[PDB]
């Protein structure tokens, strides 16, 4: 089901990142290292157990969840909120809650590239990354 998305991925295009994390009230200086940063994400899978790391030169994280099965998250920019997984229409959709508010991070496969869509109020965030061999 999520077999596709699993692997080792690289960030080759990113589109309106400054404004996805300025509405997460992300500050200047962070912003500004972040929109030079290429991180690797890595997908892994032991049965029902997806573990997704995200890893750079500035922030590191790892979650591991089940699809369908809320967990706790506490993000890159440091936002501790309620977490849940699912697949739908072939896309790997999380949606983080937390004071109410809401971001949906949705990845789908497009061509053989994986695009990471992240939207946080008005501001919609486009990043597509490369499998790595
Ligand atoms: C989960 C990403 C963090 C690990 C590397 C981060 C590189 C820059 C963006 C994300 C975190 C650091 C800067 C603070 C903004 C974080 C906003 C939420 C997470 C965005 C992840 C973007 C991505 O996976 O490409």
Known sequence: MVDAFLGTWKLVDSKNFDDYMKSLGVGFATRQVASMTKPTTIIEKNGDILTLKTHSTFKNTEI?????????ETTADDRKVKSIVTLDGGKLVHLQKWDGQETTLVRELIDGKLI??????????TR???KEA
């Open 64 to 72: 591991s969840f089940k699809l369908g099965v809320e967990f706790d």
């Open 128 to 130: 597509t990354y490369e």
């Open 116 to 125: 990471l869509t992240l939207t946080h109020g008005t501001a919609v965030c």
